[PDB]
Design a protein. Structure first.
Length: 98
């Protein structure tokens, strides 16, 4: 629950007509930040998903993703909405497309 400063936040990258190569970049750097979760691949490139991490690490993660470095394309606009503090890291790292 909320009493634990472990925040499950949802993101959305506005990849209008796909192209957004968020993969690997996410995984590797999110690991380094100290965060867990996943990527959700839609039809029309709205790269959404879940970021769970301890408070300070999710802050860093938010500073990132807007900090847009590339393995191919531009991560075209990342909004951070749906913020809910939970308990424990309920996933095997920040992973792949689901």
């Amino acid at each position: 629950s909320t009493a634990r400063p472990l925040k499950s936040v949802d993101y959305e990258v506005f990849g209008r007509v796909q192209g957004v190569c968020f993969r690997m970049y996410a995984e590797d750097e999110a690991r380094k930040i100290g965060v867990v979760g996943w990527v959700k691949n839609t039809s029309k490139g709205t790269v959404t998903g879940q970021v769970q991490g301890p408070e300070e690490k999710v802050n860093s993660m938010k500073s990132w993703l807007s900090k847009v470095g590339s393995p191919s394309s531009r991560i075209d606009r990342t909004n951070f909405s749906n913020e809910k503090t939970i308990s424990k890291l309920e996933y095997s790292n920040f992973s792949v497309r689901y």
